[PDB]
Every structure is written in structure tokens, then in C-alpha cells.
């Protein structure tokens, strides 16, 4: 940042009637979340050319990423492994995300482990 600072500041002592631009190219970590942008099978119904008309961009599509719920309610007959099965997790995972709760009653709100399929 110190070099960058000297460099941005050379604009104050530049020669007469001369200006400048600063191009920067730096390296930066990006993060690809398979949680937010999951890789899934193509839908059971496909998408036509018809979802691509003009203004389809404004009408037929949401902005990516899609919102996938991180919270699920436990049904009556359900159990730890039944809930894990319904959500697509290992039971271990579902217990770690929910660590506060030891046992799960019907009609209780639960955290869905982010890796769930």
C-alpha cells in the first residue's frame, strides 16, 4: 500500500500541462461456493428458446445466485436420520449444524447444513 500511495501521489508533482492514468493489475483471491452456486443435474423439464425473448432478461429470470433455504421445520413422525435423509445429509452433519439441540421434537425449527443436496 505504501508504494501504491507514492505512486498515486505522483499526480501532484507532474510536469506542466501533463496528466496521467493509473492502471493496476493485481492478484486477488476469489471464492467459489458450491453452497451458493451448487452444481446440480439439469432440470427434469428443460428450458426453451422461449425463456430467452427480448425482455426475458427482465421478466422470466432472477439474478443469480438463487436463494436456497438454510432453515427447515421438522415434521411430526420425523427423526434425526429421517430429517437428514429428507435434506440430503449425513446425520453427523445435521447434528453439527444444529449442535444446540440434543433431540428434535415435531414442529421445531432446524438449521440445514449448507452442503445438503
Amino acid at each position: 500500500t505504501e508504494f501504491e500511495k507514492r505512486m498515486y501521489d505522483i499526480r501532484h508533482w507532474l510536469h506542466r500541462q501533463t496528466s496521467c492514468e493509473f492502471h493496476t493489475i493485481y492478484r486477488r483471491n476469489v471464492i467459489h461456493d458450491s453452497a451458493v452456486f451448487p452444481t446440480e443435474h439439469d432440470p427434469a423439464t428443460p428450458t426453451t428458446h422461449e425463456h430467452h425473448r427480448m425482455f426475458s432478461f427482465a421478466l422470466d429470470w432472477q439474478s443469480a445466485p438463487v436463494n436456497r433455504l438454510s432453515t427447515d421445520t421438522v415434521h411430526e413422525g420425523e427423526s434425526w436420520d429421517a430429517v437428514a435423509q429428507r435434506l440430503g445429509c449425513s446425520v453427523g452433519e445435521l447434528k453439527d449444524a444444529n449442535a444446540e439441540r440434543e433431540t428434535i421434537e415435531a414442529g421445531v425449527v432446524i438449521n440445514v447444513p449448507v452442503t445438503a443436496t
Binding site: 492514468e21 493489475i25 493485481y26 483471491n29 476469489v30 471464492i31 458450491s34
Partner: protein, 97 residues
């Protein structure tokens, strides 16, 4: 012919002894399954060498990101979860004042 040297002979006994030694220096490689103590196959000697060379030189992506953030001060967040992946990237842009 004074400069010419005899190519030494290395018996499997020696090789397996040295391999135990390696295993006892780096226990974690036997745990994590980099090398096996056993020398059975003809190519096993070479194979373990190659596994070692890979373990030492191949940097796991999360580690790579962390290392680059330390001394080169590379900014960006860095994901430690298995479902995240650290992509080294560039950003170009302009400034004018």
C-alpha cells in the same frame, strides 16, 4: 580411465531399511497413506519416491491462498470449508484524477 567410477550396487535390504527410517522420521506419511513401509513390487521403490515428491511439492489450494496472503499480502477472503474453493485471479482497473 582414472575418472571413471563404478556404479554402486543397492540391495533391497538396504532400500527397505532406509524406507523404515523414513517412515519413523515422518510418521504422518504412513498415517495419511503417502508411503507404505512394505517394498513388495519391483516398482514400489520408485513409486514411493514419486509419492514423496508429490506430497512435498503439491500445495493444497487453501494453503496456497493463505501462504500468498502472508508475505505477498494478496487480498481476498479465503475459504476453509470443503465446499469452497480458492481461485487465484487478477483484477485490472483504471483510476484517473
Amino acid at each position: 580411465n582414472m575418472n571413471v567410477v563404478q556404479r554402486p550396487c543397492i540391495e533391497d535390504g538396504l532400500l527397505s531399511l532406509v524406507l523404515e527410517a523414513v517412515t519413523k522420521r515422518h510418521p504422518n506419511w504412513v498415517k495419511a497413506g503417502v508411503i507404505q513401509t512394505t517394498l513388495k513390487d519391483p516398482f514400489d521403490a520408485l513409486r514411493w519416491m514419486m509419492h514423496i515428491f508429490i506430497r512435498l511439492s503439491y500445495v493444497p489450494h487453501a494453503g496456497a491462498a493463505t501462504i500468498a496472503r502472508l508475505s505477498r499480502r494478496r487480498i481476498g477472503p479465503i475459504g476453509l470449508e470443503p465446499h469452497q474453493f480458492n481461485v487465484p485471479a487478477e483484477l485490472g482497473f483504471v483510476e484517473q484524477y
